[PDB]
Ligand binder design. Structure first.
Ligand SMILES: Cc1cc(-c2nc3cnc(Oc4cccc(Cl)c4)nc3o2)cc(C)c1OCC(=O)O
Lengths: 340, 58, 226, 299
């Protein structure tokens, strides 16, 4: 009655004034500000390593904090930990349930985090006296399938599940320390910050929201998309972030002001983004696609500057190493490739 | 009634978010491109790397 | 070739050997997905004296020489579109439909007579882009209740176009042809039909026959002799 | 040298004292070179079609490519032999005369061995059922090498032994300077290969029928067996019905004596019929399969 109609009319005026404030502060575009700078030349990249040994599709990959070791996760039920510079393997951890979609490497190189469609999470330990791998925790309590999970510290982890929620957990306690809710679809990916302390996430309700890690409530919301958000990445500076989608329109947003800056798109692409990663300068914005190749795009000019077509099936995971000397791509054809 | 609580917490979120400050997109992009230009000297991805400094080389 | 490099190569060789050894035993197990509505009797089939071993609840059983593996994906309330591409190499998709629910109103939503939304679900799962060469083996649920109810209840409420008699045979055949007429891919995939029987041996033998027919067809297509 | 060749041809009677001008003026030659050019065309389109698609990489496709390459070599061998047939009773050394026939025999044996290898591989794959179908490269390499080596050895054997250059009584009439024992060995090999192929295909069909009909007794509302039978009868009918004439001609040659049978001077038609059969393999081996014709329609 009066309560409900007053409440949503007040929400209407609040939304209108928020949109007015968003429009007022926008005076130009990144293209206008950077209309005088040399375009990046044609980028040539060649495969240097052809890591093989998986017998199913590849769904995730995460670089270590040393640029020496990788992690994969196939549907065969394996969590091979590769070792670059040699192509040899160092671990062949077998999973319990062969339904995995996430990976995580600890920043100190001690533990590995895994989790898929079985509604639980696992933390395997590497540095042990036995010289093997043993499950130390089996964090459970979610309702939907886990979409992503990235380490926050050596004793703190954060996860996002398909029941419109995220959870900041606590290892060695097995308790959901913090809960984040508000989404209406399902959180498909999230990214951390260079200094942590904040994290952004995206769902299938055509939205992208930022969350603090202490008080536990959404700060702002960034709409604009017309499709699902199944990929996200954070700028190294910490004041902007990219966003993929299933309709091949990469977006670049701003934390300081909720604005639309870039609209990365073309006319010969009708597929969907799968992964997005930045570089130290934040100039070469890599991206994945369903049309069997990865197209690296310049961020400032918002135009194509190279194609990494070397795969057979859809690319599913993509990653830039920490210091930066190569990138890793993994598709459904059971092949990991190292471009440089 | 769950709907009234949903609406009231939604409007509380909206009004508490409305108090955030806003910045000029032009100067934000200026700092963005300044950082991009500054932290690009080595950048072994876009800058060509010598063969002797290429670990991923046989 | 130093000592540590040789040790690393030996470790990699052992890891690869073990992985290849373990990857062959998993290539001889037939995977069968299971689907069905809420009150579609998915609990009784997995309890029907055959299964030995939230989210996925994988079940293992063995018949003759084949080692089957059944995934009961029923605990998920999220969108089926974002995780259905994982099940792409499945050999078959068992489907259960409740025959004794042609008149009861669907829960929490009026109408659809507990069968119309079942036909929409079957249409959505059959005419998919990932399932183009997978059988749609279909089990028809409780029939004793169906035959005792149809003897004294009207059928035209769910299908107001049927002028036939109220006998068991004609009604069952009409339901079978209605469910079998939604297969748009008439040349690639085939749908089998079976009325649920109390005996476990009948159902298990039907599943075995269907999967061995699928294996024969797959081998014929692989050899190029099809 | 030249005297031996002319003496052998005079003894056989094929010299005919050829006094025709250098011009070919033969309609048979032109129609046959157009036919073999068509064969080469079909083979080269098959080779490009199988090469372009990345999906076509299974060992079945490798055997098909082997057969296509063998047919391509056979067509070139036939056209080379035909273009040089005019100056056969003069202007030729025994070495080149033997080389022509050796190349011809290698080209006409490689295709038969490729068909045998394809049948063996199909029987092996169909004998045991697997959920995921694959093959070890060892067996593929072994077969694809052994067929070529045995064909080359069979072709190159006459160049040194069984050359009939000394004996004037054991030389055949269709092909002078050839001992009949080599012809008998070749025809025994051919009939053994035919028997093996027929037995293998019959066993495949019988296994499929027995496994399908008896084991499965589901409800009712067998096309696989009918399609398999149709394919088997088509391939066997083509193969025997268009390799029989050369078999019969070789048997008639080894049976008749010199200056006894006045029919053998017609081998060109039987040879071109055999080459036509070898050429029309891709039609059968791509028309039956749905996917190959779909890809061809796409291309
Ligand atoms: C030039 C020429 C060649 C041939 C000829 N080429 C053959 C190749 N193979 C076989 O037997 C096979 C064939 C295939 C597989 C096996 Cl296992 C044995 N018979 C052949 O006959 C015949 C005549 C009349 C010729 O013309 C006479 C001239 O030179 O003037």
């Amino acid at each position: 009655g009066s309560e409900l109609d007053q409440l949503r009319q007040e929400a209407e005026q609040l939304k209108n004034q928020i949109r007015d404030a968003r429009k007022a502060c926008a005076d130009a575009t990144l293209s206008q500000i950077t209309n005088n700078i040399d375009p990046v030349g044609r980028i040539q990249m060649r495969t240097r390593r052809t890591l093989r040994g998986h017998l199913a599709k590849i769904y995730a990959m995460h670089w270590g904090t040393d640029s020496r070791l990788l992690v994969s996760a196939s549907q065969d039920g394996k969590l091979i930990i590769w070792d670059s510079y040699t192509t040899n393997k160092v671990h062949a951890i077998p999973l319990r349930s062969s339904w995995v979609m996430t990976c995580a490497y600890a920043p100190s190189g001690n533990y590995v985090a895994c989790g898929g469609l079985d509604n639980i999470c696992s933390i395997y330990n590497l540095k042990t006296r036995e010289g093997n791998v043993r499950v130390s925790r089996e964090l459970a309590g979610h309702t939907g399938y886990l979409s992503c999970c990235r380490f926050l510290d050596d004793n703190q982890i954060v996860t996002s599940s398909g029941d419109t929620t995220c959870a900041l957990w606590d290892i060695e306690t097995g308790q959901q320390t913090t809960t984040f809710t508000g989404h209406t679809g399902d959180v498909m990916s999230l990214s951390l910050a260079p200094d942590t302390r904040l994290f952004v996430s995206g769902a299938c309700d055509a939205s992208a929201k930022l969350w603090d890690v202490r008080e536990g409530m959404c700060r702002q919301t960034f709409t604009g998309h017309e499709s699902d958000i199944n990929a996200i990445c954070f700028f190294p500076n910490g004041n902007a972030f990219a966003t993929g989608s299933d309709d091949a329109t990469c977006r670049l947003f701003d934390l300081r002001a909720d604005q639309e800056l870039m609209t990365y798109s073309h006319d010969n692409i009708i597929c969907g983004i799968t992964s997005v990663s930045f570089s130290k300068s934040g100039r070469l914005l890599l991206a994945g696609y369903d049309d069997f190749n990865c197209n690296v795009w310049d961020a400032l000019k918002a135009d194509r500057a190279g194609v990494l077509a070397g795969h057979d099936n859809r690319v599913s995971c993509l990653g830039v190493t920490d210091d930066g000397m190569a990138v890793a791509t993994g598709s459904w054809d059971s092949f990991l490739k190292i471009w440089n | 009634t769950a709907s009234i609580a949903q609406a009231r917490k939604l409007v509380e979120q909206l009004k508490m978010e409305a108090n955030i400050d806003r910045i000029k997109v032009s100067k934000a992009a200026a700092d963005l491109m300044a950082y991009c230009e500054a932290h690009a000297k080595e950048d072994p991805l876009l800058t060509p790397v010598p063969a002797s400094e290429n670990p991923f080389r046989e | 070739l130093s000592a540590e490099d040789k040790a690393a190569v030996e470790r990699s060789k052992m890891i690869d050997r073990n992985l290849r050894e373990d990857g062959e035993k998993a290539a001889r197990e037939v995977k069968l997905l299971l689907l069905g509505a809420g009150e579609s009797g998915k609990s009784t089939i997995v309890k029907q004296m055959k299964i030995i071993h939230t989210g996925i609840v994988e079940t293992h059983f063995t018949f003759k020489d084949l080692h089957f593996k059944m995934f009961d994906v029923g605990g998920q309330r999220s969108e089926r579109k974002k995780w259905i591409h994982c099940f792409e190499g499945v050999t078959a998709i068992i489907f259960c439909v409740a025959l004794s629910d042609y008149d009861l109103v669907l829960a929490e939503d009026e109408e659809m007579n507990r069968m119309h939304e079942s036909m929409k679900l079957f249409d959505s799962i059959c005419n998919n882009k990932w399932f183009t060469d997978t059988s749609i083996i279909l089990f028809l649920n409780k029939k004793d209740l169906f035959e005792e109810k149809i003897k004294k209840s009207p059928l035209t409420i769910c299908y107001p176009e049927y002028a036939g008699s109220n006998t068991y045979e004609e009604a069952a055949a009409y339901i079978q042809c209605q469910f079998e007429d939604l297969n748009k891919r008439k040349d690639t995939k085939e749908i089998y039909t079976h009325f649920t029987c109390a005996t476990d041996t009948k159902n298990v033998q039907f599943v075995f026959d269907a999967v061995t027919d699928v294996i024969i067809k797959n081998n014929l297509k692989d050899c190029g002799l099809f | 040298n030249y005297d031996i060749i002319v003496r052998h041809y005079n003894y056989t009677g094929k010299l005919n004292i050829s006094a025709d001008k250098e011009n070919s003026i033969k309609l048979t030659s032109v129609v046959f070179i157009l036919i073999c050019c068509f064969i080469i065309l079909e083979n080269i389109f098959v080779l490009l079609t199988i090469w372009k698609t990345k999906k076509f990489h299974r060992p079945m496709y490798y055997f098909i490519g082997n057969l296509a390459l063998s047919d391509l070599l056979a067509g070139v061998a036939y056209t080379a032999n035909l273009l040089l047939s005019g100056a056969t009773t003069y202007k030729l050394t025994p070495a080149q005369w033997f080389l022509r026939e050796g190349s011809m025999f290698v080209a006409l044996s490689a295709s038969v061995f490729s068909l045998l290898a394809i049948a063996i591989e199909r029987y092996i794959t169909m004998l045991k059922m697997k959920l995921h179908n694959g093959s070890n490269n060892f067996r593929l390499f072994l077969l694809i090498s052994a067929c070529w080596v045995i064909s080359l050895i069979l072709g190159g054997l006459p160049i040194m032994g069984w050359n009939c250059i000394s004996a004037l009584s054991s030389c055949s009439t269709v092909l002078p300077l050839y001992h009949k024992h080599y012809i008998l060995f070749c025809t025994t090999v051919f009939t053994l290969l035919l028997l093996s192929i027929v037995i293998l295909y019959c066993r495949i069909y019988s296994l499929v029928r027995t496994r399908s009909r008896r084991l499965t007794f589901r409800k009712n509302i067998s096309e696989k067996s009918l399609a398999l039978l149709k394919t088997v009868i088509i391939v066997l009918s083509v193969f025997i019905a268009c390799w029989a004439p050369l078999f019969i001609l070789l048997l008639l040659d080894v049976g008749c004596k010199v200056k006894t049978c006045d029919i053998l001077f017609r081998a060109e038609y039987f040879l071109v019929l055999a080459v036509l059969n070898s050429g029309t393999n891709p039609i059968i081996y791509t028309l039956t399969n749905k996917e190959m014709r779909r890809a061809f329609i796409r291309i």
